[PDB]
Subunit: 282 residues, 6 copies
């Protein structure tokens, strides 16, 4: 609680100059085209552009705490809109270029974007999600569930059970949801391409899953404004804003970024849509 | 034919005053959110708003016959458009809030609305539908099949059979289609919420299926302008026009009522669409 | 209240089909088409008429009451309402003259500047003082040009009154002027679900005739002026408008729920016209 | 190469007069409505309207060669747009009226139209498609693969293999892809309706597959401006432009011809959409 | 009939790409862009040209006949036709001057008030008396300004005639006036699939030059005025218009089938312009 | 630079809800609504403000720097930006007065003829000579009305300059004229995320008051003119605009990416108005 190790907070930002930036995004486009199974890992940096502060950035929650100051929110969790990044991911899954999405984020935005829950692992929980301790049925609310740390929310299970509903936000000492972890791990191991977005990769085991991909010769790309724990393991490191990178990527892949219909929950991935043919690369 | 018992015809209409109306529709919204499996039962009252007279209402077919007068049609069966109600049901199935639809209606409008035939039981038949007596293959026509009472229509089966095509409109003495009945029954038993719309519930076994739900503690709601046979069994009775109720319900559920593309037949339910997250209710 | 509950007439299918082709000809050939509607175009949305078998008056005579299958608020525009919307959008409808108080033309999105609502609108109140109109989301509580108990809010605090004519009232000068002018300059007037029994409304169609203008009547029952029409189509207006739009190569557009459009928008692209003669 | 038999080139075109044309398209509409399984066979004539010359027509590749002249292209293969015909076929598959599509065309347009690859047999190959000689994984490029005759393209396999990529365009002496052929054959045999579009039916076994359908009493329709090898076997021969025929057909079937989103590849058929009810025919 | 069947020229890819970027520059920089089209923009819809390898004239000389892959009625607008539609919609096209009789610009939905059809339109007849135009759904049966056998229907019974110029006929005064005025005031004229060999049509582009206006020619073959152009792009017009719209950040819109739009609608939102120099 | 970093105020939910209903009343009742925006409406797209807790000035005082979560080029319009787009489209917004230099109103598709950008726009340069404006796809490289190093291309070769006011500069005469006129004639001014601390911009809202016009302020922090407002809503502008559009029965439209619309298009159909009193 007080003792919690919060890692390296407030490290200097790095910005690749424009031409290096454009050439790296081109290479990401190349890796994606070539890959059989692509897995995305996201953290708090993909939501900063919607007004939600991250943890370890210059104005992050833990950074600010270290300086005796406060983080700033520019939205509520209910009023937050998914970023261009979140919506690019929706599309990448729909056209079959994204196999699995692993997120450390609690902010509920991938769910709310309409990303399919069976291709998503929410490793640290979701603030809109409460779970029955008896039957394990989950409920995805339109408002944040008012507790954190796996506590009773005060509501009961309505399954055709009356079990005590509890939040899914892990405290420091709590181990990860086993189903989420087992599926993120399997996906990570079997991927031939793992792409990290807006995560410093400092938390175990979450930040370690992209390394699993480096097994059997998989490639690792890291998109992030600050250094990350596994920088030396990356085949490609892109230092820029994740929305600028993802919009350029989509442009290269010949994909529109889909409109957000408002908060909407999709349990199961729909059938894959058509996508553009692949370039001749070599 | 002449002997047929036509039940209680022409009973006085009941109208819940506005504030009671709005509070009951709110509670229906609450029951739907809470339910695992929701089954809808429809009858003739859901089509009166498209110009098709019902049977037992004040200007109903059997009511008018009793007074020596005639029912009035404001449309042909071919020219009838599905109501706001019919289209709300299309949407509820698409987003996964409706498990099954049971209808006593012959008017062909749920089919024509594009409601999926494998989630629909047409207990008393469909006027556009003719069936091979040999192979049992059904054909869904753009025009009413000119006979009633399971008679030869005059056309033959084209299955890659030459069997005699017959109508599917039950006469009084004819027992129900076994497949339709078996599936309506299963759905009704296993539901935890059954909602009746525009049916007096006077015909066996059709009107009795919503009671099956009251087994193992399922809830029964009845929407209807007139009294119904099972009024005392209802957890909730809403006395108002079904379009006013369904539009308000959709508003609360955060669902648009979809546009009608014209007459269109869907054999199999598509994959479920995203829907809004559920409120915290208790 | 006039002749009520007269027998319905139904053209056989082959005739029905011939006559709609003939109406399509007239539309294609005409420069200025005016449409006149009454209560028959709302009966397929659950709103009774006045003088049909089960109409308001026809039922009152027999001691019966008319039946509603909807509230005014929860009524949806018919396929006919929406076809007229499209007809105006692609420049094939010049003006629309309605007897109907039921609010549906307005709520369909039809432009108010190309519509005369000769007998009022249940959803519309007007300021006794500044004459400003308000289109409400529910029926204005009164009938017969009475105080609704609301006051104007323009920049007035005038007394707002319903727009619903009692038997003795003069028609809106503005609406009637515009509807007369349109009727007079049309080379084609088409009536849809009106018995044509009220003055002056029922007679506006005849003004088209005075100029060599054609006149089409579309009605289940006999109307006052059947003798003056070049074509009478006995059938359900929805059936007739649906076939006609098909011939015109026009889709019937989706309703986006209640919506108020004050001014006609620029005209949309339309199908090329057939060779006729 | 030089020896290759190129069949009957440059035969006179036949045009059915308008009223005969309209009556035949009506009968095609009738056969389609009646059929359980409909299989389409296409060749080069369905792409002439996009600026790609056919082989045996009056200005065909082989015809012109015979007269010592050159064919004319009005587009590149990359810049070619699918015809009204190609897009009608997309729609017919989507609404479930087309079971399978067999094509002799190499021009890549059915793929690019977004026609589902698992309902398509490309008997003579696709110019955008290259294939690994090791693992047999196919790649669908945005540009024509620069070789013909099953040669090494120069690129290698990227499967999570490094096998030599080769083109899929058959030379004269090369036998057909076995998977494509086996599936076209199965479909053809089991169909009760086979419709040929823009093919002279002169190549074995491709042009012979529509005859398979005449087994067990299947019907054969041939749409083509010139005579075809199997003219005498046809139940119906329509002599006119394939776009005029298909647009009229769609009009009768009550189907819109869908918009082309640009080049887009769909591996697996989506779930079937609603379609209009069938007329009463007899 | 002039020089026919001249060799085709194909710019290599890298050049091709450079030149389209250069055309995008000119569009972005220009205030008033006029487009001039002839038969080369319809060849990818199966309609032969006149003077290309397999053109009407080129084939007639050699004893061959041209080949159609479509009827006029069943022809669809090209990607080029539809890009011009979009170009006018977002305010990047001022006027369109076409030599083409094939009906496609009109049927694409292009606004008739921003188009001069200098040689006629196969689908259009006109009243000898009142000069009223009719855009039909099929080709008017005649050529050379003849009676079609139909009569006017305005409010006239005038004799309707095709609009298709024979060799000896003066061009529509109205269309030619407007096309000259546009050509003169443009700072950019772009020609698409025209050999520029007919007077006066072929010369209208040169009028842009007289003012400091730029001139771009886009054509597989040499044209009359290659010497006066600032940029010549040798390639297929579809390829060139597709890349160009991509640079402009414009989608090519779907065709809703044959549709007739008389007047340009208000302009749509367009992408912001790049920094150039 | 004025009072910076003042404490935030948060209305409790029930109050919050009451006050938005009250703002919906005012919109429905008003004939002419002007909206005034500053840096608070862009903070939810990752662009810092000036005087909030972590604002440009508030941070500079404390030795801190403001933080960007986006580039100007990669910033997307907020739900607020897009709601204003819709509000203007259905005729419920008369004019928009912004202090914001960030380009978002323009890039949202908002019509330039109904917007005063009082302090400039990072994407806009202007010709010193002919005064022609250019809306670029990237930020113009300079600030303070300097040469950008590009020259005009109208039909001019004038020196193009940024439009970004330094502290000492007079506001665009044109934009300020129009914004004053609008403010004066509005019966409702609504401020969104502006502390109202700069002259003359901050004071334009008060001009509405002088006529019996209402004034609403929507801001997390105290503003200069809280004492003159009829309603103060302390909350996040996105939350407030979303609830309000829901009450108005308006959808918030999708962004089609950066797009420049010079002139307001004809008004769209809107929901009928509730009965109020
Ligand atoms: C991305 C950082 C921004 N902050 C957040 O996203 C919130 C905390 N937010 C607030 O306290 C502020 N707050 C503000 C609101 C408003 N904006 O007005 C509102 O409505 N609700 C609210 O809670 N999330 C969390 O506190 C949980 C983070 C979490 N960590 C772990 C974990 C597991 C294993 C090891 N180490 C940590 N599992 O869950
Ligand atoms: C909802 C009531 C309105 N009437 C209807 O829907 C029609 C009967 N309609 C007409 O006779 C008038 N008619 C009018 C047309 C036009 N409107 O011009 C037209 O085209 N065809 C036509 O038939 N349906 C029926 O007659 C069948 C009702 C039925 N009952 C049973 C059943 C089973 C077990 C026990 N008890 C009864 N199974 O089927
Ligand atoms: C439909 C006829 C038009 N021509 C085509 O489609 C091209 C050949 N085209 C060109 O040589 C010209 N060319 C032009 C381009 C441009 N238009 O600028 C371009 O980009 N590429 C290009 O190759 N296709 C073929 O050459 C292969 C035909 C094929 N036949 C067989 C086969 C199998 C069994 C028995 N008998 C034959 N398997 O594949
Ligand atoms: N717009 C942006 N573009 C690119 N990178 C960005 C952007 N915004 C921020 N970043 C980078 O995004 C990175 C975010 O890193 P951290 O703040 O550690 O977030 P986590 O998800 O990895 O924290 C993991 C867990 O630790 C906590 O205890 C919670 O339990 C979390 O669930 C920074 O390096 C920024 O530079
Ligand atoms: N707009 C409306 N809103 C609400 N309720 C309505 C509305 N319109 C009518 N109702 C009510 O809707 C109810 C309709 O009840 P019945 O007329 O018995 O129809 P069924 O489907 O139950 O008849 C069953 C079978 O019996 C026949 O023999 C046939 O075989 C039928 O298939 C009334 O109580 C109305 O008050
Ligand atoms: N679906 C239908 N299709 C065709 N005709 C129809 C349909 N439904 C009804 N009809 C015919 O539609 C006709 C409707 O005739 P009337 O009832 O006199 O309505 P009005 O608008 O002309 O009455 C005028 C005023 O009278 C009052 O005082 C009020 O002030 C009214 O404003 C009938 O003949 C039906 O046969
Ligand atoms: N618009 C049109 N409408 C109708 N028919 C048309 C049209 N255009 C052309 N046709 C007819 O379309 C027909 C096309 O016949 P062929 O040219 O033999 O093409 P294939 O696909 O059968 O050649 C098979 C293989 O042979 C080669 O060696 C390759 O390997 C091919 O893959 C003609 O009869 C035209 O009259
Ligand atoms: N896809 C293509 N891409 C580019 N250029 C093309 C394409 N297809 C053809 N071309 C070129 O397009 C050019 C077309 O040149 P011409 O055939 O003279 O057509 P006109 O419209 O200029 O003839 C004017 C009048 O002449 C008659 O008397 C009629 O009255 C006509 O109205 C060729 O040079 C091709 O190289
Ligand atoms: N999401 C939000 N919701 C509501 N209020 C917000 C939000 N975010 C910030 N605020 C409030 O938004 C307010 C923003 O106030 P200021 O920072 O002065 O911006 P200006 O546009 O008024 O500054 C004017 C000029 O000053 C400079 O010199 C430049 O020239 C500017 O153009 C704060 O009070 C926050 O409480
Ligand atoms: Zn439980
Ligand atoms: Zn059978
Ligand atoms: Zn007043
Ligand atoms: Zn391989
Ligand atoms: Zn004339
Ligand atoms: Zn200048």
């Amino acid at each position: 609680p007080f003792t919690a190790d919060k890692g390296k907070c407030g490290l200097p930002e790095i910005f690749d100059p424009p031409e290096e930036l454009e050439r790296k995004v081109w290479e990401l486009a190349r890796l994606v085209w070539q890959s059989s199974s692509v897995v995305f890992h996201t953290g708090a940096g993909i939501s900063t552009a919607s007004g939600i502060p991250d943890f370890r950035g210059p104005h992050g929650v833990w950074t600010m705490e270290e300086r005796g100051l406060a983080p700033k929110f520019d939205t509520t969790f209910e009023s937050a809109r998914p970023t261009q990044t979140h919506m690019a991911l929706v599309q990448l899954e729909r056209v079959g270029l994204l196999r699995f999405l692993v997120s450390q984020n609690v902010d509920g935005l991938h769910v709310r974007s309409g990303f399919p829950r069976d291709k998503l692992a929410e490793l640290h929980g979701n603030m809109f999600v409460e779970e029955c301790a008896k039957c394990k049925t989950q409920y995805v609310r339109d408002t944040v569930v008012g507790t954190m740390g796996l506590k009773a929310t005060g509501r009961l299970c309505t399954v055709a059970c009356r079990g005590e509903l509890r939040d899914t936000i892990l405290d420091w000492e709590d181990s990860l949801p086993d189903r989420d972890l087992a599926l993120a791990d399997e996906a990570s191991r079997n991927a031939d391409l793992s792409i990290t977005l807006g995560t410093s990769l400092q938390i175990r085991p979450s930040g370690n899953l992209p390394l699993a991909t480096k097994r059997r010769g998989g490639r690792l790309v890291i998109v992030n404004l600050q250094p990350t724990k596994h920088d030396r393991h990356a085949d490609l490191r892109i230092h820029g804003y994740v929305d600028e990178v993802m919009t350029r990527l989509m442009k290269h892949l010949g994909l529109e970024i889909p409109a957000w219909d408002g908060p909407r929950v999709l349990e199961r991935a729909l059938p894959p849509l058509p996508r553009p043919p692949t370039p001749k690369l070599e």
